[PDB]
Amino acid sequence: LDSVLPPSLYALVFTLGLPANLLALWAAWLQVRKGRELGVYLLNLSLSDLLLICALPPWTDYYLRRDVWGYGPGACRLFGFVFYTNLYVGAAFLSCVSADRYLAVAHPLRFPGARPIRSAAAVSALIWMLELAANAPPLLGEAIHRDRYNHTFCYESYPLSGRGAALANVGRVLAGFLLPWGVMMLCYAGLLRALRGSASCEQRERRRVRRLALGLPCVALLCYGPYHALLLLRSLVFLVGGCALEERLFPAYHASLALATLNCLADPALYCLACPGARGEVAKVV
Template sequence: MVNSTDNATEQCIIDHNIHQILSPVVYIFVFIIGLPANCLSLYYGYLQIKAKNELGIYLCNLTVADLFYIFSLPFWIQYVLQHDNWTYDELLCKICGILLYENIYISVGFLCCISIDRYLAVVHPFRFHQFRTMKAAMIVSAVIWTKEIMTCCFVFTRGEISMDAESHVVCFEHYPIKDWEHNINYYRFSAGFLFPFFLLAFSYCGILRVVHKSHGTQKNKKIQIKRLVSSTVFIFLVCFGPYHILLVIRSVFENNCSFADKIFNIYHASLLLTTFNCVADPVLYCFSSESTYHNFAKIRDSCLTCLGCLKTEMKESYQLSAPETPNRPQHEQQPGLLQKSCDTTETMEDSSINMGYL
């Protein structure tokens, strides 16, 4: 039950149509695409850890943060489809809200770790070895998780469900925003977006400068690195930039229901953009690597080969059960040739796989 004395907010009448039209589509898309993509990403991070690569620790932590948020999406889908009416208890609202914000800021933290790790590996390959070890990566990861959990425990000690003008129980929504949220939003903008963006920009500018000056790097490799770096910064700005800018705008100007209603749609559209980070992370940091591409190409080709063999077996089974005819064509009387062709394909696949490993 909502405590009307403690949790009641100004009775703003807000048009929530964006939640019935756009939000379910985005949440369902991210859940369907993000869940398998992040599971594969987690496996890729495990392979990196197994190979004693500290980058795998950052990738696994980044993926775990994404998966935690993806698992909370069914609750948000039901929430928006019920016209922003939270039907569960307040504890679950807090948990889902924490997973939402944890996903944003833990993702930002580990994106910075990955960028700094790559910067040290490319720009200072023979220095700072103590910062590029498995132990250092585990310590940094523990610090990031501890910091964000403590921040959430400090921020979300207040009641996070309230009653709107339509008697709906809303979760993590205050219109207009409360006084205590202003300073928190300024902190989230500066420490959670602006500072990490400068770290990202500094790291990748250093990487691009070294790659540009390198005469031993092939031209296509340089293009690939530049595209990856520029895509990372671009997706960081698109996923997190609009949301944090609107946090500051709300903190400065939102002091009445009229402004809250005007900015509601664009603010929640920016919040939906942060959700796409769960899909962008595995694409950028895992599926863009050449070794991962070859691994998925192997899986794809193996599946196609198995499907081809399955079709052959089904055809042979049909031919064995069919009545014999004296005028059957020569190639149908020797189905073993098709099986041999399939075996030949498998042999060629093995050769290409071996070439890929080389």
């Protein structure tokens, strides 16, 4: 069985990501102190990572309680809200970073155009507001349940509430994963296609950019694929044996979130440890 796995992984994510995410926070702010458009997007991605890291400790006890809530009678909507909203916001800002890089590379002569910090912060605040307003129906004190024995996981629905309400998972799958991930696909593919004519960079730089721009989307997919795959499968079938399907597909779905939480530790490594300047800032921190 796997009731040690999730919480142990969460601890590994806390203990390592949270310091590394603070360091990435400082690196992003010292980057944006010079007027870097990518700085605000990196800042917000690190912010979401910190929010996941700080929301994890309730989930640790939650699991250790064999999924039945112990922390609060009703205070769990907040923790579910922050967890899921960060889960979506991280992908959104990954997409924004990819788009910024694509516009910087493909059209170096026409982007940025007017004090990009202002428009970038506008887009960032719009993403935050829209994600919060899209996750609001998922945490307001609406539903909670228990079926057999000590099974009251916060705001879960085994089985799904019904085809008239099960479409929240489908909407989240399409508009929280597929759209940002497809945007990153197109943006990094366009970046590689624009790098083709550069007389300057040799193979040693084109192939490095190829590893970077076809290795970060791969990590994002590896971290945010199983969760949305299981969710989409569950919801799509439930629209269309349901009992036995929920029985079999529960213990792997609940451990796919352990893989999803690895993105909040992988993103600093792929966006701070990759850049030499952020390594210099880290050497300044000590």
